[PDB]
């Protein structure tokens, strides 16, 4: 209802303009409005939704990391007692980030996932669900940390199961899902061996399927394969 008076097509058009202008908060609000029109999203529209929120939350995560590092240093032995300001401001950014994640998860639950029947859309949305629970997990410290982690795991796992049955090993969504689930294992679940095994198997199975692809699809798939390789090089 924030965007309730604007046409769906105008919201999509403005999301594209906002992307060009690097106005990602606007882009996300336009795409939220488009989702709330109640129609399913096309492939291009799903990518616009993902780009918008990834850039918004990406800035929040980077800021949270800067502030958390300062806060940790302030809590080292020998640090001069500053007041509550670093914690207060880290908490402010954290609450904002959590709100963005909750907004995305809300769109997925009402009602993107339940209407998504094709593999490409359902895997995309379940990957997104895993990603935004993962971002919640990065800042979680309380009673629900374990349940947040399990929610990320469960979403990624359902997406993996579908992708393995319904998509070729080079499919970019499948590859990006596996990349991110492998990061979840390494950074969130304290499972570096699972992370490495998943990245290696994903890379090798994609390599063996490249021969089936056109030049343009080959370019798309090898770009994400390189990210798997980059992580394996960091981790081994």
């Amino acid at each position: 209802g924030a965007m309730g008076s604007m046409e769906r097509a105008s919201l999509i058009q403005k999301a594209k303009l906002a992307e060009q202008a690097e106005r990602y908060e606007d882009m996300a609000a336009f795409m939220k409005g488009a989702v709330e029109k109640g129609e399913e999203l096309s492939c291009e529209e799903r990518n616009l939704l993902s780009v918008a929120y990834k850039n918004v939350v990406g800035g929040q995560r980077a800021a949270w990391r800067v502030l958390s590092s300062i806060e940790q240093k302030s809590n080292e032995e020998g640090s001069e007692e500053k007041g509550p300001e670093v914690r207060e401001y880290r908490e402010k950014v954290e609450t904002e980030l959590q709100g963005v994640c909750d907004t995305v998860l809300g769109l997925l639950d009402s009602h993107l996932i339940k209407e998504a029947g094709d593999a490409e859309s359902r895997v995309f949305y379940l990957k997104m669900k895993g990603d935004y629970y993962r971002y919640l997990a990065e800042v979680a410290t309380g009673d629900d940390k374990k349940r947040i982690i399990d929610s990320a795991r469960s979403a990624y796992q359902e997406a993996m199961d579908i992708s393995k049955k319904e998509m070729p090993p080079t499919n970019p969504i499948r590859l990006g899902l596996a990349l991110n689930f492998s990061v979840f294992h390494y950074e969130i679940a304290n499972s570096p061996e699972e992370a490495i095994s998943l990245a290696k198997t994903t890379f090798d199975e994609a390599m063996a399927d490249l021969h089936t692809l056109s030049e343009d699809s080959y370019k798309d798939s090898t770009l994400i394969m390189q990210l798997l390789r980059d992580n394996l090089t960091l981790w081994t």
Partner: peptide
């Protein structure tokens, strides 16, 4: 360093 995820940026 922090590991790479997709999409980037």
């Amino acid at each position: 360093r922090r590991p790479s995820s997709w999409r980037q940026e």
